[PDB]
């Protein structure tokens, strides 16, 4: 399994514009558009994002393209960030791929605000970290999907995802 496939089932796939879990515009894998009320604004993100009058609706190989952009910028922030570099060097190759996730879904700031779990991470306290991670509003919003990337965390394979 790998970075690709596992957000792709934690994200899904939508061609159409869609309002997400907290009201939000985004579209194909998880790509946020905007926080914004403005249906036109989002609109406007995307067309400016694709290159096209799109009228909030896209190809599949458009938003796989968004998608590997996404994944791409996911792994510079956490390149870039002091925080977040010495975790990921330190982890094996199931569990840096947990990290990317959450640095996708969140942004690599919010990530490098997990203080606690990333120094637990950082010293393999698999156990402690993941019970620290669920004590998040994260986790209480995504419930399900949190439960899989702790998981992964938790036991470095690809079980949660099986
Ligand atoms: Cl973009
Ligand atoms: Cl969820
Ligand atoms: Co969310």
Same mark, same amino acid.
């Given at each position: 399994?790998?970075?690709?496939?596992?957000?792709?089932?934690?994200?899904?796939?939508?061609?159409?514009?869609?309002?997400?879990?907290? @009201?939000?515009?985004?579209? #194909?894998?998880?790509?946020?558009?905007?926080?914004?009320?403005?249906?036109?604004? /989002?609109?406007?993100?995307?067309?400016?994002?694709?290159?096209?009058?799109?009228? @909030?609706?896209?190809?599949?190989?458009?938003?796989?393209?968004?998608?590997?952009?996404? =994944?791409?910028? /996911?792994?510079? #922030?956490?390149?870039?960030?002091?925080?977040?570099?010495?975790?990921?060097?330190?982890?094996?190759? =199931?569990?840096?791929?947990?990290?990317?996730?959450?640095?996708?879904?969140?942004?690599?700031?919010? =990530?490098?605000?997990?203080?606690?779990?990333?120094?637990?991470?950082?010293?393999?306290?698999?156990?402690? /970290?993941?019970?620290?991670?669920?004590?998040?509003?994260?986790?209480?919003?995504?419930?399900?999907?949190?439960?899989? =990337?702790?998981?992964?965390?938790?036991?470095?394979?690809?079980?949660?995802?099986?």
């Amino acid at each position: 399994m790998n970075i690709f496939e596992m957000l792709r089932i934690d994200e899904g796939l939508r061609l159409k514009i869609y309002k997400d879990h907290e @009201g939000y515009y985004t579209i #194909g894998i998880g790509h946020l558009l905007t926080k914004s009320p403005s249906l036109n604004a /989002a609109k406007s993100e995307l067309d400016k994002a694709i290159g096209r009058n799109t009228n @909030g609706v896209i190809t599949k190989d458009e938003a796989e393209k968004l998608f590997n952009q996404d =994944v791409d910028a /996911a792994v510079r #922030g956490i390149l870039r960030n002091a925080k977040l570099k010495p975790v990921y060097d330190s982890l094996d190759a =199931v569990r840096r791929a947990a990290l990317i996730n959450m640095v996708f879904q969140m942004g690599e700031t919010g =990530v490098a605000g997990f203080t606690n779990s990333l120094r637990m991470l950082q010293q393999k306290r698999w156990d402690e /970290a993941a019970v620290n991670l669920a004590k998040s509003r994260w986790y209480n919003q995504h419930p399900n999907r949190a439960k899989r =990337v702790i998981t992964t965390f938790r036991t470095g394979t690809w079980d949660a995802y099986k």
